Amino acid sequence: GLFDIIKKVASVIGGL
Amino acid sequence: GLFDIIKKVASVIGGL
Amino acid sequence: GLFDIIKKVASVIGGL
Amino acid sequence: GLFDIIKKVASVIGGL
Amino acid sequence: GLFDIIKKVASVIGGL
Amino acid sequence: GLFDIIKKVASVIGGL
């Protein structure tokens, strides 16, 4: 789009 | 679209 | 886009 | 417990 | 607890 | 606790 928000997460426990 | 929100998660336990 | 926000997180516990 | 992680969020759109 | 991590966030769009 | 971390954020767009 024209404002783009991306988040990526890695965890052993608890990716909320 | 024209504002785009993306979230990706990896976990051994508890991806909520 | 034309203002792009990216976040990456890595953890043993608790990637909120 | 003996390690406590707390998060609160407010938004009009997209509280992921 | 004995190590305590607190986060609060406000936004119009996108509190991830 | 006995080592306490606190964060507050305000934004129009993107509080990650």
Swiss-Prot record, chains A, B, C, D, E, F:
Q: Which residues carry this modification: Leucine amide?
A: L16
InterPro entries in the cross-refs: Aurein_antimicrobial_peptide (IPR013157)
What is the source species?
Ranoidea citropa
Q: In which tissues is it expressed?
A: Expressed by the dorsal and submental skin glands.
Q: Where in the cell is it found?
A: Secreted
In terms of superkingdom, the source organism counts as Eukaryota
What protein name does the entry list? Citropin-1.3
Pfam family example for this protein? Antimicrobial20
Which lineage ranks, top first, belong to the organism behind this chain?
A: Eukaryota, Metazoa, Chordata, Craniata, Vertebrata
The free-text function statement in the UniProt record for this protein reads: Bacteriostatic action for Gram-positive bacteria.
